[PDB]
């Protein structure tokens, strides 16, 4: 049976060298072409090129000449892909694939066997703490029940960040959402609760948020405006 | 062999 | 030449035909062998069509592909639950003449599992705190809908704003419905010199908003 097994998740800084691998198993690696597919984070899938491990023929599509490259080692039938100066853009999984079908006598035309895909991140952010600002009840005095309020976490490295409110006595109708990745490569999330109207005049809310990273832990007290 | 690419029909890239 | 071209997204119920289509150039989709692939979440991509209109070994007679000058069609018919995923039309374009593999875009097929629902949008404007540090980010949360497709647009009183806005990826929230969330990044003289901004949400054909003013 076929298979192509690539190497493990991969998280890096801007700046660094990678090579990442991909083994072939149950065929002859000296005679087929293996091409290689990226995906950036949202995106749709991208050639890359394909290299022939017989000869070391390559091709690579006009985006990819020059910013990577690709070789083989037929020692441990393995191909690889490197970079020596990952940038953040290069955030993205990576597959290779066998290019085969074996639909006439000789040729290829298809990519047939897949691996799994190999993760890698590329960061040119450092470890850094959250700035965390109160999101303030809009309205005070409404007509439809409820009134939502939060916390913004701004601008930390890396994830995760875990937020609280009340330090976990209030659970209930609390939304933290997914992080933003900001083109500084800082992280931005917020999370919000839902509360009855009524109890501003009562209830104080605090957001507790913890980064491990950076040993960070604020609490905010969210309290309506003036 | 295995090498030659074949776009379309009748047709091939590194044919040998 | 060199693109083949998709609709971003399609849907369908349990048991309905559908068609995913690619339009190409006489580079590729015209004269060159066409195939199509599936993409489900946590596994790579499987051949279903090689060369213009043949089924892969395996795959479910269900699946089905044609050509027409520079278009190509992938017909699903008895769509299945497992049938969600992203589904993508290649070629061989030879534009440089050499053998240059192009993929489409890319189709995300939602197959509708519960009833469509529409989003939550909340909107907060800067914290005084952020402005006392002379910043400003302006927050849109939009969460409940589904499917899991949205866009968002902001205006600056009525102005389209295009600078300064970061949006996440939708995800799958814990009861199955999407979640996403928008960021406008301005400086405080830019918040306070404008008489309103708003985040516009569309899903489905249908935009709501929310607005804020400095006051």
Known sequence: EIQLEQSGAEVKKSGESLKISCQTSGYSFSDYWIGWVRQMPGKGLEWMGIFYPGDSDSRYSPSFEGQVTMSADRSTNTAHLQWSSLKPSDTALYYCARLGGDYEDSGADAFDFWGQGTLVTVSSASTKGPSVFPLAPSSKSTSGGTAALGCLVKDYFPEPVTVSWNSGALTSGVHTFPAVLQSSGLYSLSSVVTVPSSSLGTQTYICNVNHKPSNTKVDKKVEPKS | ?16 | QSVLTQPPSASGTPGQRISISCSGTSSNVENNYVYWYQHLPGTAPKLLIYRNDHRSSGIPDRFSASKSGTSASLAISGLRPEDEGDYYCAAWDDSRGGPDWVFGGGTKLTVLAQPKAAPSVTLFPPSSEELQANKATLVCLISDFYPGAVTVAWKADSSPVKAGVETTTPSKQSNNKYAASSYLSLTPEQWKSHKSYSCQVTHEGSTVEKTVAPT
């Open chain 2, 1 to 16: 062999t295995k090498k030659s690419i074949k776009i379309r029909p009748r047709q091939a890239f590194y044919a040998t």
